[PDB]
């Protein structure tokens, strides 16, 4: 169990479009499997709902790179001093710095402005005289980048760069491009950081700079970079792809769409079922076991790289009966789309606010809303960590 049993790159775009038969085939063989990912990394996948849930929570699985046998590349080593790539105590201190910002009740205060963004976006989209636009271009991309940039203080002219950068390190065309995108991003962000110093800004990045400058032990210049990185990315493509993936899932299931429209109180569950069925985090961020870990006979060496395949947990039928059915009334509680345990998503209330407002906006404002593409005209990314589409063509009357 040391060369990979499968090269996911080799399976081409059919794996990208529909990875679930691959993972379910693995599950039927066991909990853990050595694979080569499309970008060339050799890693272990963890499959099946109970094992996935347990590995997510398990402190035998570190997220700290000093526990990884694979070293960080130069560009990645700029950025790793972030909460998601730490264990306690560092994780504990870093999450405390921004916790207050992202509670349900603080994020609720952003409702008028989020609603405002969505309303103007849907307004501009609906101007198309033919009744056809791209929902990714018109809504799903522009909304989250706007909201997070205003929170942090990223000037409007600088926002376009991030789609380009973050695209390159999700679907790298080649291993180099994703490293160079990473470098430019970190450079931009260090320049952004320095530009806040002494300017008395009221934004999140401005507060963090002052915290860092007041006591470097409390937040170091490296941690400030990594924090800015984490908040911009782990939010980015995730929230953008939640909204496009969930709207694709609802528009491809006309029975469900009709039901939601008929009873808009189904909205919250509809967004939960979107996360369950086609959540953006197909596999959780890397875990490194700190000692050999035995998973039903399959031993992962200490220090190897472990992806927990959240997407496969969500299709496990013992936990989610009739799991291939998109059903906005199912009980979704216990899904893993926001993780589980001490790393559970901190942006989860913001993500929910965004996706809820966007989804309801589209339903109320686009009569006869439907996909304007044939199922196989769509293009998904190969990367097993993120589930996402390039375009989502839609139409309305
Ligand atoms: C629908 C959109 C989102 C999804 C699906 C998502 C998913 C996740 C998941 C699965 C994790 C845990 C990863 C792991 O254990 O390996 C995570 C953690 C995290 N998320 Fe999100 N997230 C989303 C939105 C956001 C937003 C909008 C923000 C920030 C403004 C954000 C910030 C973070 C951060 C900082 C962590 C690190 C938490 C920690 O280590 O304690 N996320 N997210
Ligand atoms: C779960 C939510 C996101 O996780 C992250 O932000 C991780 C921590 C990021 O990796 C690093 O920083 C790497 N480190 C060694 C510096 C992102 C950039 C990983 C990538 C697949 C992405 O663009 C999408 C990432 C999401 C899956």
From Swiss-Prot:
EC number: 1.14.15.33
Gene Ontology biological-process entries: macrolide biosynthetic process
Alphabetized GO MF terms: heme binding; iron ion binding; monooxygenase activity; oxidoreductase activity, acting on paired donors, with incorporation or reduction of molecular oxygen
Deletion phenotype: Abolishes the production of methymycin, neomethymycin and pikromycin and leads to the accumulation of their precursors.
Cofactor or coenzyme needed: heme
Keyword S-adenosyl-L-methionine in record: no
Assigned protein family: Belongs to the cytochrome P450 family.
Identification of the protein by name: Cytochrome P450 monooxygenase PikC
Source organism (scientific name): Streptomyces venezuelae
Gene name per UniProt: pikC
């Amino acid at each position: 169990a040391s060369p990979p049993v499968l090269d996911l790159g080799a399976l081409g775009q059919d794996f990208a479009a529909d990875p679930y038969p691959t993972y379910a085939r693995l599950r039927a063989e066991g909990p853990a499997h050595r694979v080569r990912t499309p970008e060339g990394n050799e890693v272990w996948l963890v499959v099946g709902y109970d094992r996935a849930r347990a590995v997510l929570a398990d402190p035998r699985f570190s997220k700290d790179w000093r526990n990884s046998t694979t070293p960080l590349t130069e560009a990645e080593a700029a950025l790793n001093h972030n909460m998601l790539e730490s264990d306690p105590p560092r994780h504990t201190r870093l999450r405390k710095l921004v916790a207050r910002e992202f509670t349900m009740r603080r994020v609720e205060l952003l409702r008028p402005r989020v609603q405002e963004i969505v309303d103007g976006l849907v307004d501009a989209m609906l101007a198309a005289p033919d009744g056809r636009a791209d929902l990714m271009e018109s809504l799903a991309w522009p909304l989250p980048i706007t909201v997070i940039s205003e929170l942090l203080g990223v000037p409007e002219p600088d926002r376009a760069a991030f789609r380009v950068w973050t695209d390159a390190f999700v679907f790298p065309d080649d291993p180099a491009q994703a490293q160079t995108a990473m470098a430019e991003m970190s450079g931009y962000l260090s320049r952004l950081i320095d530009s806040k110093r002494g300017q008395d800004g009221e934004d999140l990045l401005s507060a963090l700079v002052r915290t860092s400058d007041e006591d470097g032990s409390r937040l170091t210049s490296e941690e400030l970079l990594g924090m800015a990185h984490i908040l911009l990315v782990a939010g980015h493509e995730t929230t953008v792809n939640l909204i496009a993936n969930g709207m694709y899932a609802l528009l491809s299931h006309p029975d469900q769409l009709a039901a939601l429209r008929a009873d808009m109180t189904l909205l919250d569950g509809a967004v939960e079922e979107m996360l369950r069925y086609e959540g953006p985090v197909e596999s959780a961020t890397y875990r490194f076991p700190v000692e050999p870990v035995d998973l039903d006979g399959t031993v992962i060496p200490a220090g190897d790289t472990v992806l927990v395949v959240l997407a496969d947990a969500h299709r496990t039928p013992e936990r989610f009966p009739d799991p291939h059915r998109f059903d906005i009334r199912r009980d979704t509680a216990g899904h893993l789309a926001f993780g589980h345990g001490i790393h559970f998503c901190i942006g989860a209330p913001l993500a929910r606010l965004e996706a809820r407002i966007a989804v309801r906006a589209l339903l109320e404002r686009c009569p006869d809303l439907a996909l304007d593409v044939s199922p196989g005209e769509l293009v998904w990314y190969p990367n097993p960590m993120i589930r996402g589409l390039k375009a989502l063509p839609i139409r309305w009357r």
